Amino acid sequence: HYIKHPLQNRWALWFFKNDKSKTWQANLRLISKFDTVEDFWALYNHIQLSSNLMPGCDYSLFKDGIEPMWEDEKNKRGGRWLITLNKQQRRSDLDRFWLETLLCLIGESFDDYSDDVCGAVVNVRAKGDKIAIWTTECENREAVTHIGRVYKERLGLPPKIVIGYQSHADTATKSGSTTKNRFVV
Numbered sequence: 001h002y003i004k005h006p007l008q009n010r011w012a013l014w015f016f017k018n019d020k021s022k023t024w025q026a027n028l029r030l031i032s033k034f035d036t037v038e039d040f041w042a043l044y045n046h047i048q049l050s051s052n053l054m055p056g057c058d059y060s061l062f063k064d065g066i067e068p069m070w071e072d073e074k075n076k077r078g079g080r081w082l083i084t085l086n087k088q089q090r091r092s093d094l095d096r097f098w099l100e101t102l103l104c105l106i107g108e109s110f111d112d113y114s115d116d117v118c119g120a121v122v123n124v125r126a127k128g129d130k131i132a133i134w135t136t137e138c139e140n141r142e143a144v145t146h147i148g149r150v151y152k153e154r155l156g157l158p159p160k161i162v163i164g165y166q167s168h169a170d171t172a173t174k175s176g177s178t179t180k181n182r183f184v185v
């Protein structure tokens with residue numbers, strides 16, 4: 001006799017394939033949804049590792065009903081904690097960071113503040129991979145800095161590796177690299 005173990009939230013995994021020829025939203029696809037521990041692992045164990053995705057592709061894991069784009073009602077006032085990897089971190093760090101990030105999401109690791117969490121995004125880029133946790137209100141300093149502190153610790157980043165929180169509104173009018181930060185931790 002085997003019962004499934006429900007998650008606190010239902011989650012959706014999305015795939016993105018870069019193509020600057022096409023409008024951004026056109027490049028996004030919903031893959032599938034899950035709401036149990038068992039189904040999370042069945043999906044994770046089945047699918048390609050972030051380290052193996054083609055340059056230009058993304059995975060996003062977002063709460064059911066939130067599309068992984070700035071436009072969504074739950075993101076437009078929000079922002080993201082951004083982890084930028086160097087080229088050598090592609091191997092034997094990207095996959096660890098991504099799984100630890102997924103587990104922060106589906107395990108509701110930020111306690112009461114996990115409610116402010118929208119999802120997480122991994123960008124596979126030749127320039128330097130990126131992982132981010134998206135939250136719903138960029139002006140909620142308490143929530144945002146709590147999530148950032150816990151997240152940085154969970155990933156075991158050295159203290160002197162400083163990570164930044166960008167508002168999506170700023171990002172949409174510049175670039176995630178040249179975007180100035182609202183917060184650091």
Ligand SMILES: CN1CN([C@@H]2O[C@H](COP(=O)(O)OP(=O)(O)OP(=O)(O)O)[C@@H](O)[C@H]2O)c2nc(N)[nH]c(=O)c21
Nearest residue numbers: 024025068069070071123125127130174175176177178
């Ligand atoms: C998250 N993005 C990204 N994006 C478009 O896609 C561009 C590239 O964003 P990105 O893929 O997140 O990062 P990256 O490829 O490393 O490029 P960059 O250095 O400009 O940040 C952005 O400059 C923006 O024009 C978006 N466009 C819309 N309409 N909604 C969105 O949510 C997003």
Ligand SMILES: O=C(O)/C(Cc1ccccc1[N+](=O)[O-])=N/Nc1nc(-c2ccc(Br)cc2)cs1
Nearest residue numbers: 015016017026027028029031032043046047048
């Ligand atoms: O053109 C490609 O390269 C595409 C199709 C695509 C997708 C988005 C936008 C455009 C296009 N396109 O150009 O046709 N790849 N699709 C992929 N799906 C997965 C995938 C992985 C795990 C699970 Br579980 C299910 C699916 C990996 S790559």
